[PDB]
């Protein structure tokens, strides 16, 4: 079975996040709810590795559910946007209502079986299609939540592109 998705982040065949076409509705709501309340959210100042909050995405100037990854200098923190998959450095953090923290992350961490692969060529191939639909076959869900899959692009297991 193949699931429609959008590869939003891609650091390699071992580490890349995607968004399932089915979590799109919920994510769309998360966005409305976080935009409808963005301005009234109190400042979140407990910056510690792992903490959940709502951080501002430099490109958008928009706040998204995020998880702090590292504490840098002068308020700056490397955050991870759980519903997307990309990272960023920002200084703008706000509290995350517990009702809007209950939902699961809407982007899924993935990887292809290293056992079947042996890279800058595929990287550009994926990024050149950031705005296009792919397909995943979830072969398993690793113990840490990371999916092990096979990536398709209009029916070509992109694995054909790996030597």
């Amino acid at each position: 079975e193949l699931h429609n998705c959008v590869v939003v982040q891609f650091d390699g065949p071992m580490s890349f996040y995607v968004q399932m076409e089915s979590d799109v509705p919920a994510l769309e709501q998360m966005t409305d709810k976080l935009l409808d309340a963005e301005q009234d959210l109190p400042a979140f100042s407990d910056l510690k590795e792992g903490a959940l909050c709502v951080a501002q995405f430099p490109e958008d100037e928009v706040f998204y559910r995020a998880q702090i990854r590292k504490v840098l200098d002068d308020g700056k923190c490397e955050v991870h946007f759980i519903d997307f998959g990309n990272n960023a450095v920002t200084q703008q953090f706000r509290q995350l209502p517990e009702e809007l923290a209950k939902p699961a992350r809407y982007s899924r961490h993935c990887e292809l079986d290293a056992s079947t692969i042996s890279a800058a060529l595929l990287q550009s191939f994926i990024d050149t299609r950031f705005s296009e639909t792919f397909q995943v076959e979830i072969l398993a869900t690793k113990g840490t939540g990371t999916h092990v899959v096979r990536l398709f692009y209009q029916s070509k297991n992109i694995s054909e592109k790996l030597q």
């Binding site: 968004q19 799109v24 994510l27 966005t31 997307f84």
Partner: peptide, 7 residues
């Protein structure tokens, strides 16, 4: 990119 970016 992605979805539900909002802007």
């Amino acid at each position: 990119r992605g979805r539900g970016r909002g802007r």
